[PDB]
């Protein structure tokens, strides 16, 4: 009796369920959307207690067979709060680290950007947008200078990567806040349920992307409330024209 339970984003939990049909055991895995990278070990009712990095090597009769990676690379469920971004700010996501890197943006005066490490097809999850969880009230009350990295999650929650966590030397557990804006983007923000970060958003490709291509997303600020930083207002004029 092996069960696979998929999230709408393509990640899954897999293992033998307990008596009560819960994902509880010492041999449960979260499998990322590549259907190959996994976090394997102790879960309780689908929550990751101790997941070790693994590669899904094959399935036999539906049952996944994993090989553990070397290192003592372990992860656990660690949802951010209003004040804490991560228990391990410097521990990278292992799926994201194989797919993207941060470098100088090709967009003029845009600072750093996020780039593809390898060629990927359409609909590929590339990066995760984790951050602290604050209210729309807090965000909407403060200056644009403090709102460079704020991403609406839902009606009650905004995800932010505030200073000094906007620098990779201080935070690199996720890198989605590094993707720059484009009115002609190659990626979108999409909902994602992550075993370490909880419910967040990810960056997903719209189309095939080449290695070393800059990943961009449409930030989606209200154009007719435009409520936006000045650099975006400028770019909006150019795009429309």
């Amino acid at each position: 009796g092996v069960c696979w339970i998929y999230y709408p984003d393509g990640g899954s939990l897999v293992g033998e369920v307990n008596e009560d049909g819960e994902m509880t055991g010492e041999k449960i895995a979260y499998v990322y959307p590549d259907e190959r990278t996994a976090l394997y070990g102790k879960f309780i009712d689908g929550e990751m207690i101790e997941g070790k990095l693994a590669t899904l090597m094959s399935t036999e009769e539906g049952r996944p067979h994993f090989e553990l990676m070397p290192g003592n690379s372990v992860y656990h469920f660690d949802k951010s709060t209003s004040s804490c971004i991560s228990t391990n700010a410097l521990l990278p996501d292992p799926y994201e680290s194989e797919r993207v890197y941060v470098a100088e943006s090709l967009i003029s005066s845009a600072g750093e950007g996020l780039f593809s490490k390898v060629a990927v097809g359409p609909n590929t999850v590339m990066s995760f947008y984790n951050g602290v969880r604050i209210t729309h009230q807090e965000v909407d009350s403060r200056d644009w200078a403090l709102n460079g990295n704020t991403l609406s999650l839902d009606e009650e929650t905004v995800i932010d990567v505030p200073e000094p966590y906007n620098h990779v030397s201080k935070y690199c557990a996720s890198l989605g806040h590094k993707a720059n804006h484009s009115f002609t983007p190659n990626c979108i923000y999409d909902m994602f349920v992550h075993p370490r970060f909880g419910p967040i958003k990810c960056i997903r490709t719209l189309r095939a992307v080449e290695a070393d291509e800059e990943l961009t997303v449409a930030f989606g600020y209200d154009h007719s409330p435009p409520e936006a930083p000045e650099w975006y207002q400028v770019e909006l004029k150019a795009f429309q024209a």
Partner: peptide, 6 residues
């Protein structure tokens, strides 16, 4: 409104 993707 002072956030992305609302």
């Amino acid at each position: 409104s002072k956030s992305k993707d609302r």
